């Protein structure tokens, strides 16, 4: 009861900062998005294709077994 009153009362003061709309314009002015994670993909359709990064490839172990 006291906590949910004091948190909202502090939010009223902290949210009421000056200007408050130029930063909306600053954030929305960069309509190019944040840069997204790179994957190897095909040129025509963009399905992922397998990678040979050393820090992942150094953990891999395979073996050979006879067939039936």
């Amino acid at each position: 009861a006291v906590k949910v009153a004091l948190g909202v009362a502090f939010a009223f003061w902290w949210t009421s900062g000056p200007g408050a709309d130029e930063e909306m314009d600053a954030k929305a002015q960069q309509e190019p998005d944040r840069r997204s994670q790179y994957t190897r993909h095909y040129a025509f359709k963009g399905r992922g294709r397998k990678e040979f990064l050393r820090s992942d490839m150094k953990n891999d172990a395979n073996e050979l077994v006879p067939t039936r």
Partner: protein, 50 residues
């Protein structure tokens, strides 16, 4: 006493509470000042409560 057997049981309850908070910010550098106004620390993330 080799003709006895003692069975011991250990059990764990579940911890049911979980939450995940995923925020992001953005600052525009007009110059070296990183624009530390009060209406700049407002994030744009997501909240998950389980």
């Amino acid at each position: 006493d080799v003709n006895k057997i003692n069975v011991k049981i250990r059990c764990e309850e579940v911890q049911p509470k979980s939450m995940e908070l995923d925020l992001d910010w953005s600052f525009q550098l007009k110059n070296g000042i990183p624009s530390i106004n009060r209406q700049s620390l407002i994030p744009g993330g997501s909240v998950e409560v389980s």
